[PDB]
């Protein structure tokens, strides 16, 4: 299992409704859940990234 996050539901629905409302299971806040190196630096056009991380560049100690 992976602790996923958002998918933002398109009506917020936690307006406390006067004319018609329902409870039994679906209650929440505004964001749900869904349970179900040696790399270089700032050079040009296309190969900066190690994808999302950027390390392997300032261990000058140990």
């Amino acid at each position: 299992h992976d602790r996923r996050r958002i998918p933002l539901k398109t009506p917020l629905t936690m307006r406390v409704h006067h004319p018609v409302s329902l409870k039994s299971r679906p209650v929440m806040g505004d964001h749900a859940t869904d349970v179900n190196s040696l790399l270089p630096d700032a050079r040009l056009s296309c190969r900066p990234a190690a994808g999302s991380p950027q390390l392997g560049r300032t261990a000058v100690m140990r």
Partner: protein, 64 residues
């Protein structure tokens, strides 16, 4: 029968035993407010009754 202060998160599941264990704490607070000068199990204010059916074996409360 213990009383639990419920925790109001955000982005969780609501259940009615947050509302009930919220609501049953304030009455227990007012009890311990009241028991600081006075010292008895309290009683009756303003009982009133009906008497018309009393020729038969019948009663009727009106205000308690």
């Amino acid at each position: 029968m213990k009383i639990y202060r419920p925790l109001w998160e955000d982005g969780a599941f609501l259940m009615p035993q947050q509302f009930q264990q919220q609501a049953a704490w304030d009455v227990h607070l007012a009890d311990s407010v009241a028991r600081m000068g006075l010292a008895h199990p309290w009683g009756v204010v303003a009982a009133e009754f009906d008497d018309s059916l009393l020729p038969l074996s019948r009663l009727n409360a009106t205000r308690l």
